[model samples]
Target chain A: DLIWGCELNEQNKTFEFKVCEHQLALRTVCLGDKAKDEFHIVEIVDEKSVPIATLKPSILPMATMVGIELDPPVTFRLKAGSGPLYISGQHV
Target chain B: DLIWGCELNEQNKTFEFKVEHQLALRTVCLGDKAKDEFHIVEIVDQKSVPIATLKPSILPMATMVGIELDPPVTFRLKAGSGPLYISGQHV
Candidate 1:
């Protein structure tokens, strides 16, 4: 089975997602609260899961309007399942 | 001045267009039917003026799905000074 998870950051008005397989994990970030916004894949972590990632609201303006920010990140994980993942932020 | 136009072909899902200036006209065509698809300017009429445009549904899918088709077509025509021009089919 494939595990999919999404997170929202109200302060910056952005959304991020995690897609994982048995041996690899991929993460993507998009602008706005909507699922259809422009997205970029940033970081990739290998072999082990790293600590959760966070984005400050202020950093959003730089990524969008000015086109300057860190690339979205991707990571690797050991296992994949359809379990509920936690995204630390406001719900909407 | 610049003029723009579009047409749809329900049968083959293609679109075609004509653009013209006071002395010349340009024509072009695109795939099936869908709004906001990709377009190529097939014709150039003259030093001044613009032609109408269209997008066929099929062409964008060609690009999105990575298919190849013949290059879009372009042509020039003599222009008239009226705002309304006629196409073979109108709806």
Candidate 2:
């Protein structure tokens, strides 16, 4: 299912997926429609603000980070650069 | 601890983490010294044949792919150069 999906860019830079009861297992991070040549530093953080994973996606047209499962109540932010960062996962 | 790790270059390109029973693979990622080029990573069996191939472009530094691999795990970098980081719990 769609855990968290958003059009991330300089204007809208952060997204938070709040898990209330169940744990979330992030499955994929899809980057599409990249607007610039520079790379986007996508950072995933837990509720405590500790980083879970960081990714650098360049102008690869479309890039995907798959086969990943992460803890929930997490936030996704573009620490640098900008584009659409879509996150998908399931409840575990 | 160290599940499996090795440098993939012109000289050293393969390493096998022989598992007695099984291995619960958590993550597969690259290190800081990864080259700015395309990469093709493979997970093979004891016979040195590939069972899976990780996607190339997304195998950058700080990039982690959560994958599952069973016993007799062997790593081979079919292309590119870097320190391949493999981490997981052994069962």
Candidate 3:
């Protein structure tokens, strides 16, 4: 279930994923649709906003499934570097 | 669990990871405790294994974990490395 999106910025910014309502597992992070191997550094942050996993953003066009290992209780932020960005994670 | 360990002759050779009678997940293809930072090239399975464990084009410092399917799990790495760790857990 996709709990949140939008309300996000494209350059050096932060967003939220509240695993606070339904139970979920992190499958993969989809960072929008595009080409070009250029990635903005993304970090998965916790409740206190601490980074757990650091993911290098990719120009994966249209919901690209990038394999990541995050087991949940994932009230984390998609913190990034300076650039335009679009990203989200899949949960079930 | 600490399944197995060995002094593998890396100039040219191979090794396997099976618990004699058990299944394992997330094989931690690694170097020795006092390990080596050698790179890896390929992977194979004889009993049950996953394609991910084939530590291909893999490097060191950054860690990696791979699950298995069906085939005898044997690993092929660069000139040096150690301690293939197997752990089991789920969401």
TM-score of each: 0.16, 0.48, 0.33
| C-alpha lDDT score of every prediction, in listed order | 0.25, 0.52, 0.36
Of candidates 3 and 1, the better by TM-score: 3
By TM-score, rank the candidates, best first.
2, 3, 1
Give lDDT tens digits, candidate 1, residues B11-31: 322333333122112223232
DockQ of each: 0.01, 0.11, 0.06
lDDT of 3 by residue, B1-91 (tens): 2112222334434556543243334223333231434444345644332332212123212223444333455655444443322222231
The candidate maximizing lDDT is 2
Q: What clash count goes with each model?
A: 18, 0, 16
Can you write out model 1's per-residue Cα lDDT over A1-92, one digit (the tens) per residue? 34444543333223333322222222232233332222111211334322111112222211211111112343322111111222221111
Model 1 shows how many backbone clashes? 18
Q: Candidate 3: where is the Cα deviation over 4 Å?
A: A1-3, A6-12, A19-21, A26-37, A46-83, B1-91
Error of 2 at A50 (Å): 13
TM-score of chain A of 1: 0.22
